[PDB]
C-alpha atoms as one frame of an Amber mdcrd trajectory, in Angstrom:
protein
 107.006  82.206 152.952 105.647  78.882 151.557 107.699  77.534 148.639 106.095
  76.709 145.354 105.510  72.960 144.912 108.333  71.280 143.024 108.248  68.074
 140.956 111.603  66.319 140.522 112.178  63.366 138.162 115.422  61.352 137.869
 116.995  57.860 138.133 116.970  56.910 141.785 119.935  54.960 143.238 120.867
  53.910 146.741 124.315  55.264 147.645 126.051  52.369 149.433 129.021  54.243
 150.837 131.968  53.067 152.922 135.514  53.875 153.748 137.530  51.112 152.197
 141.139  50.050 151.916 143.359  50.580 148.832 143.280  46.767 148.526 139.487
  46.994 147.963 139.994  49.216 144.899 142.635  46.943 143.446 140.462  43.875
 144.060 137.723  45.348 141.857 140.071  46.932 139.357 139.129  50.498 140.232
 141.096  53.578 139.268 140.921  55.811 142.322 138.666  58.890 141.884 136.879
  57.596 138.777 133.215  56.781 138.240 132.088  53.773 136.073 129.184  51.464
 135.421 129.233  48.005 136.984 130.874  45.416 134.649 132.038  41.758 134.999
 135.256  43.066 136.510 133.414  44.522 139.541 131.153  41.500 140.262 130.929
  41.079 144.021 131.540  44.711 144.935 128.143  45.305 146.600 128.293  42.106
 148.634 131.800  43.058 149.870 131.075  46.675 150.575 128.153  45.611 152.796
 130.604  43.807 155.110 132.455  47.052 155.899 131.518  47.964 159.470 131.170
  51.642 158.529 128.847  51.234 155.513 126.073  53.745 155.081 122.951  53.689
 152.893 121.750  56.999 151.544 119.164  57.867 148.870 121.029  58.947 145.768
 121.108  59.592 142.097 121.587  63.133 140.890 117.926  64.321 141.010 117.207
  62.677 144.327 120.243  64.551 145.746 118.853  67.864 144.353 115.500  67.004
 145.898 117.126  66.277 149.279 119.180  69.416 149.322 116.182  71.506 148.212
 114.001  69.934 150.964 116.825  70.491 153.481 116.664  74.211 152.786 112.914
  74.294 153.735 112.641  72.192 156.856 109.322  73.879 157.710 107.512  72.219
 154.744 108.257  68.480 155.013 105.640  66.560 153.008 104.484  69.844 151.481
 107.184  70.944 148.977 109.008  68.375 146.808 107.587  65.359 145.010 110.085
  62.930 143.479 109.315  60.492 140.656 111.474  57.571 139.515 111.579  53.809
 139.348 112.893  51.515 142.113 112.200  47.833 142.966 110.544  46.409 145.990
 113.724  45.153 147.712 115.815  46.126 150.781 117.699  48.950 148.901 114.467
  50.324 147.448 112.973  50.101 150.915 115.816  52.067 152.466 115.871  54.575
 149.627 112.126  55.331 149.819 111.785  55.482 153.644 114.979  57.524 154.149
 113.754  60.018 151.529 110.281  60.129 153.145 111.746  60.699 156.599 113.599
  63.698 155.128 110.246  65.188 153.944 110.111  64.197 150.231 106.920  62.680
 148.802 108.206  59.683 146.963 105.847  58.912 144.016 108.067  56.178 142.763
 107.228  53.061 140.806 108.154  49.633 142.099 109.185  47.570 139.078 109.785
  43.804 138.763 112.029  44.124 135.738 115.221  44.714 137.828 116.544  45.391
 141.371 116.811  48.963 142.689 119.637  51.129 141.265 122.666  51.596 143.443
 126.085  53.131 143.507 129.008  51.787 145.506 130.688  54.918 146.852 134.186
  53.709 147.757 135.753  56.305 150.047 139.516  56.543 150.478 140.293  59.775
 152.369 138.934  62.749 150.404 138.658  60.567 147.275 135.536  58.773 146.104
 135.574  56.038 143.434 132.057  55.205 142.113 130.574  51.996 140.707 126.996
  52.381 139.470 124.288  50.016 138.359 121.090  51.785 137.163 118.966  48.701
 137.884 115.244  49.549 138.073 115.707  53.232 137.222 115.943  52.231 133.550
 112.490  50.722 133.576 110.264  53.619 134.550 107.064  52.846 132.706 104.401
  54.814 130.829 101.895  53.057 133.047 103.373  54.648 136.198 103.623  58.028
 134.447  99.843  57.942 133.892  99.000  56.650 137.409  96.767  59.010 139.406
  99.496  59.768 141.969 101.921  61.013 139.360  99.215  62.892 137.387  97.986
  64.561 140.602 101.558  65.399 141.634 102.127  67.050 138.248  98.711  68.828
 138.501  99.632  70.183 141.961 103.251  71.323 141.219 104.441  74.564 139.581
 108.188  73.948 139.110 109.317  70.852 137.193 112.907  69.716 137.332 114.329
  66.880 135.149 117.921  65.660 134.996 119.375  64.998 131.579 119.603  61.284
 132.572 115.821  61.053 132.248 116.385  61.409 128.487 118.268  58.044 128.437
 115.276  56.187 129.756 112.241  57.378 127.706 111.861  60.878 126.307 108.005
  60.551 126.360 107.867  60.504 130.157 109.656  63.864 130.001 107.418  65.323
 127.275 104.389  64.456 129.428 105.675  66.724 132.212 106.474  69.462 129.629
 102.786  69.364 128.646 101.744  69.509 132.332 103.991  72.486 132.933 102.163
  74.170 130.084  98.770  73.344 131.688  99.596  74.563 135.195 101.460  77.567
 133.803 104.517  76.300 135.635 108.212  76.316 135.017 110.222  73.560 133.304
 113.972  73.143 134.056 116.595  70.686 132.910 120.071  69.962 134.041 122.294
  68.782 131.167 123.723  66.248 133.609 126.691  64.857 131.677 128.405  65.551
 128.260 127.452  62.157 126.853 123.778  63.247 127.029 124.431  65.825 124.254
 126.675  63.470 122.312 124.421  60.350 122.355 120.927  61.557 123.267 120.756
  64.793 121.247 117.527  63.733 119.479 115.775  63.295 122.828 117.194  66.531
 124.206 116.106  68.245 121.004 112.431  67.316 121.615 112.428  68.769 125.132
 114.387  71.960 124.595 111.524  74.044 123.174 109.603  73.555 126.403 112.570
  74.277 128.640 112.441  77.617 130.507 115.674  77.099 132.417 118.726  75.191
 131.224 121.454  74.366 133.824 124.879  72.803 133.109 128.577  72.888 133.901
 131.383  73.959 131.611 131.978  70.597 129.921 128.250  69.975 129.393 127.896
  73.556 127.971 130.754  72.799 125.631 129.290  69.504 124.491 126.015  71.393
 124.023 127.956  73.793 121.745 129.311  70.815 119.804 125.784  69.410 119.389
 124.449  72.717 118.047 127.517  73.061 115.752 128.467  76.224 117.689 132.193
  76.331 117.183 133.416  78.316 120.216 135.030  77.812 123.633 133.438  80.834
 125.168 130.822  79.689 127.713 129.282  83.178 127.776 128.709  82.954 124.015
 127.187  79.506 124.460 124.804  80.926 127.042 123.686  83.807 124.731 122.958
  81.423 121.904 121.157  78.993 124.208 118.878  81.849 125.199 118.085  83.260
 121.781 118.997  80.653 119.174 117.582  77.415 120.679 113.863  77.161 119.927
 111.651  78.364 122.736 107.873  78.143 122.879 107.312  79.247 126.499 106.034
  82.489 128.020 108.061  82.871 131.240 111.363  83.614 129.429 114.446  81.476
 128.903 117.249  81.421 131.455 120.636  79.734 131.078 122.944  78.951 133.970
 126.385  77.572 133.178 128.612  76.801 136.184 132.377  76.919 135.517 134.156
  75.187 138.383 137.197  77.339 139.258 135.553  80.275 137.323 132.456  82.415
 137.787 129.001  81.068 137.004 127.388  82.431 133.824 123.805  83.679 133.976
 121.992  84.569 130.754 118.508  85.687 129.670 117.000  87.910 126.922 118.202
  90.953 128.832 121.935  89.860 128.629 124.729  87.891 130.359 126.132  88.372
 133.923 128.676  86.391 135.863 128.369  85.361 139.461 131.623  85.050 141.363
 132.549  81.792 143.096 134.964  80.927 145.928 138.408  79.551 145.173 137.690
  76.140 146.798 141.027  75.678 148.540 142.029  72.942 148.956 142.692  70.309
 151.604 138.903  70.707 152.216 137.145  69.439 149.000 135.829  66.015 150.214
 132.830  65.431 147.822 133.828  66.846 144.400 131.305  64.377 142.847 128.053
  65.778 144.366 128.812  69.474 143.855 126.529  69.963 140.867 123.577  68.239
 142.546 123.993  70.396 145.674 124.176  73.533 143.511 121.000  72.661 141.658
 119.262  71.902 144.970 120.117  75.331 146.428 119.125  77.002 143.171 115.821
  75.233 143.146 114.905  76.036 146.779 115.616  79.757 146.221 113.643  79.760
 142.955 110.688  78.100 144.737 110.418  80.910 147.323 110.626  83.680 144.692
 114.286  84.851 144.876 115.631  86.527 141.691 118.142  84.807 139.492 121.440
  86.018 140.945 120.452  84.919 144.456 119.212  81.593 143.094 122.788  81.125
 141.791 124.250  82.347 145.079 122.086  80.035 147.094 123.371  77.258 144.863
 127.018  78.183 145.384 126.433  78.120 149.112 124.794  74.659 149.202 127.539
  73.284 146.826 130.242  74.504 149.176 128.693  73.105 152.333 128.196  69.665
 150.743 131.740  69.541 149.312 133.272  70.255 152.751 130.964  67.838 154.634
């Protein structure tokens, strides 16, 4: 069964990943297991990490990871399923990022900007721990001019599911509203991931503009809770947050609103107009959890591939749990 055509938009980054010594982390002032933006303190880190004999370069950023996992689940339809849009630069990293993604079967309708080098994240591996240092680079400069280029307009015209990370809202909310309009035209489906709690705390106005067009909202517990804070919903119950997100956040669509809140150690919450269900999860135990950082991306990717082939909502969630588990345990 041929999947519906999916349009993914995010902030693309090359994952420059290597196993490194403890000394490496100290040299760049890095608190093991944390994730931060590049600052003066970490100047040199990319140059150094590239000298590690084990370094690997992998196309990254949250939405590109979703796209890759979703494509992985439908090997039969390389070049014929997922289109990805974002902004890179025309440099070695952008070259690796685009070609690696293409080889995996994703149509990369990316812009090449001159305003910055391609985004990247130094993934410093020490055993089962990953410490991240990110520089958004070119991703921040995705332009209106690219958004109205024939390739992007045709890709929107030809897709039926639209998936945007919350990070897209930090760049320019108008690029996102364009796709919301296109989803309306093609009678497609618009989905956002809430991405990170700071999105709701600092980019609530942008999120506000997009919500009415959003058919499916996906988030984890802490993002759900910051969403609650943003709506002035004073509760800690994620199930309550899901009900309100269904029925109390403006909705102008026709497909129906769906809310999926993942809850780490606890069951995933699934909500619609017909009520709330929970979807059990494994107790991820325990000397096995190698990639705690990419779990959410992997989940969304599984979800999205099941939704594209017509599976109902519980099995979309279950497909997502499965892909999150596989990716965590390498």
